[PDB]
Amino acid sequence: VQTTSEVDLLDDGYRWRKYGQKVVKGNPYPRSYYKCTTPGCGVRKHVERAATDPKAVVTTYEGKHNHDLPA
Ligand SMILES: [Zn+2]
């Protein structure tokens, strides 16, 4: 039994949180969606990988930050 282990999100600047992901049969890699859940900041980004294309990392940043870059 192992369904109570908390993992660690690989931070890369902004604090993003996972709310939901999407899968595609035509794509080998899954679609992970996150969102900058900072004090007052509510940005939502989408991490999708273009399969049909020669490895295309299409990322859509919905919203603008309002807390500057962390230290
Ligand atoms: Zn932010």
Swiss-Prot record:
<protein>
    <recommendedName>
        <fullName>Probable WRKY transcription factor 4</fullName>
    </recommendedName>
</protein>
<feature type="DNA-binding region" description="WRKY 2">
    <location>
        <begin position="5"/>
        <end position="70"/>
    </location>
</feature>
<feature type="binding site">
    <location>
        <position position="41"/>
    </location>
    <ligand>
        <name>Zn(2+)</name>
    </ligand>
</feature>
<feature type="binding site">
    <location>
        <position position="38"/>
    </location>
    <ligand>
        <name>Zn(2+)</name>
    </ligand>
</feature>
<feature type="binding site">
    <location>
        <position position="65"/>
    </location>
    <ligand>
        <name>Zn(2+)</name>
    </ligand>
</feature>
<feature type="binding site">
    <location>
        <position position="67"/>
    </location>
    <ligand>
        <name>Zn(2+)</name>
    </ligand>
</feature>
<feature type="binding site">
    <location>
        <position position="36"/>
    </location>
    <ligand>
        <name>Zn(2+)</name>
    </ligand>
</feature>
<comment type="function">
    <text>Transcription factor that binds specifically to the W box (5'-(T)TGAC[CT]-3'), a frequently occurring elicitor-responsive cis-acting element. Has a positive role in resistance to necrotrophic pathogens (e.g. Botrytis cinerea), but a negative effect on plant resistance to biotrophic pathogens (e.g. Pseudomonas syringae).</text>
</comment>
